């Protein structure tokens, strides 16, 4: 009987995919899918108390004594002859003469014109494939059911119904449009598909492909600079400039981990006590002079302001006690904006490269650099009248330096320092440009400018200027500072040590710096369904997005990063492949008499 | 009650030269006489080096593939009448790479190797009946 046979249609590859609770006992009934195989059932228990343990897989087995295995080919082109082979399987103990016949299905061509039974005798424990050749002429997919009905001697029947999907006309074509991206040449256009091989009706799936295509001094020697401040009001700064520079330089360079962690907390107390040691030398008007009785010196007040203002980010000082200190410096500004020493320092050695033919230029540059450093520590609230005159004071000071800077015929140390001071306080561009141009010409040629105290300092100040004005010049500059600083017992003086540590700290953070490297683009076009848009963010990997754009598309790539963008388009074309075998061929001719039950 | 003559040849000089494995498939109820195939193998001048026959299917391993149309034959018998008219198949698997097969067809002595289709167009219909 045709109807009695239990057609089998459920042929999944994974069915018991779920998740459920457990209470030591549950009887879940699983209906085995109508497939003949052994199933590798397994599971994982996820408990709040105990946790996970992978279960032991269970090898359930499902099998029928007499079955029919029909294995459809995956790609079945139309207008092409097809070979289907339902291999009858008979593991019974009885010789059976069964009949195989694909039920009449619309959209197909039955070789016999329909349900023509092909009686076949199957010796027990053996297979008797009954070749069936039906040419597919349907549109999308046809489900053909093979029914094996046995004789009345032992009536066991089987019926498999597997859905056959028929591919679209012709082969499939791929278009790969390799291109580039950049921050000029921003907007690009992809020409719309215009190939004449296009089948007018067919699947047109396209995909986009965007690729990001992306490309320290010794912690031992510098850590030795941490010394307990000692001496008079002058020497307390010699041991407190490197002490803050070393603490700061390793703070920015992230070299504290190399040193034992007690060292960091050992240094945070050298500065803490150091700040008190120099604070008690403060005069009534915040001069920070060498001695309480000795006359003040604007150089030290500027130098102490820079070091103390910089350290103010750590020690819980009083902002108002620092604001007054800046007031003293301003009051010493001369008519043209210069600064004159009221009392020179007892020891000229700490001055670094200041001593020389010209001093007022360097004093003006050094003080202004320090003077700005104190702007950050000013309270955001209050002192507005105090702040305002500060900008005027530096602006007046900058004008004098710019006038001197453009004049030329100045020393190397003056030339380098002037470049940084104007750069830091945002001097007028023309003065900035001429001052910067003055530095490069005066430069000398990782050969730049052992190194005496003069050359080492000026390099550090100049090196800072290049960072603020890093392209093959700062990188080639540090190679002289670091090489010059790596010598045993390097950084002889105090001004070079405090500032050289500053440049390398600044240079290191610049060189080892990373950005977002964004590259996101936009794809838009006027498709038949309307207007659609897409974007592909590539801040930090590669992306590909399925977009429905059947016409010319618009690209608006943006971002400092550069990469490769290519678009893939898929479609069908008119086939031209020969049906006849090209390399190896068979020719078989059957001659004789074949008896037929019925013939056209 | 029915004869066969399977013929195989290779163009050569492609770099894939090698043995071949015929996959001749017979009609319904056909099985080659083991006596005939056994005679092919035993001979000193042997072409079908290894053969296995069970029911319709027949494998004729060929040690040497000649460039020309030099080929072997054999006999077959039938027991159950064939209930429908159609073309059976065949296939020559390259012994070193069965993915470069060669599917071919054939049919009854008076019939053809294809079915009747009025296709020859965008519209496409067949006339088996």
């Amino acid at each position: 009987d045709e109807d009695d046979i239990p057609v089998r249609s459920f042929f999944p590859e994974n069915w018991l995919w779920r998740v459920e609770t457990v209470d030591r006992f549950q009887i879940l009934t699983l209906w085995l899918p109508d497939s003949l195989t052994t199933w590798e059932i397994h599971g994982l228990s996820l408990s709040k108390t105990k946790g996970l343990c992978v279960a032991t897989p269970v090898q359930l087995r499902v099998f029928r004594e007499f079955h029919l295995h029909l294995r459809l080919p995956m790609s079945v082109r139309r207008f092409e002859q097809l070979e289907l082979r339902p291999v009858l399987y008979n593991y019974l103990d009885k010789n059976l003469t069964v009949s195989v016949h694909v039920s009449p299905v619309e959209g197909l061509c039955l070789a016999g014109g329909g349900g023509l039974a092909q009686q076949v005798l199957v010796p027990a424990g053996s297979a008797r494939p009954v070749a069936f050749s039906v040419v597919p002429t349907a549109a999308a997919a046809v489900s053909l059911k093979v029914v094996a009905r046995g004789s009345f001697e032992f009536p066991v029947g089987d019926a498999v119904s597997k859905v056959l999907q028929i591919e679209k006309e012709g082969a499939i074509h791929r278009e790969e449009l390799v291109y580039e991206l950049n921050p000029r040449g921003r907007t690009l256009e992809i020409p719309g598909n215009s190939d004449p091989n296009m089948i007018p009706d067919g699947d047109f799936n396209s995909y986009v492909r965007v690729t990001a295509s992306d490309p320290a001094l010794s912690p031992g020697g510098v850590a030795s600079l941490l010394r307990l401040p000692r001496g008079c009001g002058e020497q307390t700064m010699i041991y407190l400039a490197p002490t803050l520079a070393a603490s700061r330089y390793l703070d920015k360079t992230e070299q504290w981990s190399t040193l034992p962690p007690e060292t960091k907390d050992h240094a945070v107390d050298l500065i803490q006590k150091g700040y008190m040691r120099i604070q008690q030398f403060r005069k009534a008007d915040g001069s920070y002079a060498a001695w309480l009785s000795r006359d003040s010196s604007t150089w030290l007040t500027a130098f102490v302001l820079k070091v103390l203002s910089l350290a103010q980010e750590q020690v819980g000082g009083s902002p108002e006690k620092l604001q007054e200190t800046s007031n003293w410096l301003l009051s010493q500004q001369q008519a043209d904006g210069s600064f004159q020493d009221p009392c020179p320092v007892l020891d000229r050695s700490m001055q670094g490269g200041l001593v020389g033919n010209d001093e007022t230029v360097a004093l003006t540059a050094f003080v202004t650099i320090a003077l700005h450093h104190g702007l950050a520590v000013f309270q955001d609230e209050g002192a507005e009248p105090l702040k305002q005159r500060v900008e005027a004071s530096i602006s007046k000071a900058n004008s004098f330096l710019g006038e001197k800077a453009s004049a030329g015929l100045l020393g190397a140390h003056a030339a380098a320092i002037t470049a940084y001071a104007l750069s830091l306080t945002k001097a007028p561009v023309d003065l900035l440009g001429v001052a910067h141009n003055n530095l490069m010409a005066m430069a000398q040629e990782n050969l730049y400018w052992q190194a005496p105290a003069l050359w080492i300092e000026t390099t550090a100040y100049a090196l800072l200027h290049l960072l603020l004005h890093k392209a093959e010049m700062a990188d080639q500059a540090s190679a002289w500072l670091t090489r010059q600083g790596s010598f045993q017992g390097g950084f002889r003086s105090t001004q070079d040590t405090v500032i050289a540590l500053d440049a390398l700290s600044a240079y290191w953070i610049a060189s080892h710096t990373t950005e977002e490297r964004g590259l996101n683009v936009t794809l838009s076009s006027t498709g038949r369904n309307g207007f659609k848009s897409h974007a592909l963010q590539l801040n930090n990997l590669e992306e590909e997005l399925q977009f429905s754009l059947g016409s010319k598309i618009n690209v608006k790539v943006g971002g400092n990063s550069k990469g490769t963008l290519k678009v893939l388009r898929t479609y069908n074309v008119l086939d031209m492949k020969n049906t006849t075998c090209q390399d190896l061929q068979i020719e078989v001719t059957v001659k004789g008499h074949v008896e037929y039950t019925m013939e056209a | 009650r029915v004869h066969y003559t399977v013929c195989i040849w290779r163009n050569g000089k492609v770099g894939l030269s090698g043995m071949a494995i015929a996959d001749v498939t017979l009609l319904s109820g056909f099985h080659a006489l083991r006596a005939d195939l056994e005679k092919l193998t035993s001979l000193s001048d042997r072409y079908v080096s290894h053969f296995e026959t069970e029911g319709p299917h027949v494998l004729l391993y060929f040690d040497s593939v000649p460039t020309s149309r030099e080929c072997v034959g054999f006999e077959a018998v039938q027991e159950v009448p064939v209930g429908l008219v159609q073309p059976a198949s065949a296939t020559l698997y390259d012994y070193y790479n069965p993915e470069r097969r060669c599917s071919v067809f054939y049919g009854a002595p008076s019939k053809s190797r294809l079915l009747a289709t009025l296709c020859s167009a965008e519209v496409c219909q067949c006339a088996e009946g």
């Epitope: 004789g592 | 009650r1 006596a35 005679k39 001979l43 080929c71 072997v72 034959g73 006999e75």
Partner: nanobody
């Protein structure tokens, strides 16, 4: 692998027999002077199926002996101008019905004449 053949007024009959050591499908060929040889009939190894030349449909039949492994070709109702030398030959690849001359190790044949 050698072939041996041995064995009349018009309207008579003859029974030609060719003996081959090896048991195979050897067929019959005839050659007349001045013209190229043409086949008369053939028989397969098992002898189930045989074909005859179109000129001798239903007239010449072939049989084989399973013991001495020969071919028995009876020629009842001889047709007078069929005189020719008959050759029994075979190949080792069982190409039944291979009309054209692609048989190797040809036999010698025997002369037979028919008189009206």
């Amino acid at each position: 692998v050698q072939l041996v053949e041995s064995g009349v007024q018009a309207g008579g009959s003859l029974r030609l027999s060719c003996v081959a050591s090896e048991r195979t499908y050897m067929a019959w060929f005839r050659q007349a002077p001045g013209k190229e040889r043409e086949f008369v009939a053939a028989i397969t190894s098992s002898g189930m199926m045989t074909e005859y030349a179109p000129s001798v449909k239903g007239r010449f039949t072939i049989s084989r002996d399973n013991a001495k492994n020969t071919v028995y070709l009876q020629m009842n109702s001889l047709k007078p101008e069929d005189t020719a030398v008959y050759y029994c030959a075979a190949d080792l690849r069982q190409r039944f019905g291979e009309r054209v001359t692609e048989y190797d190790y040809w036999g010698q044949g025997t002369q037979v004449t028919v008189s009206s």
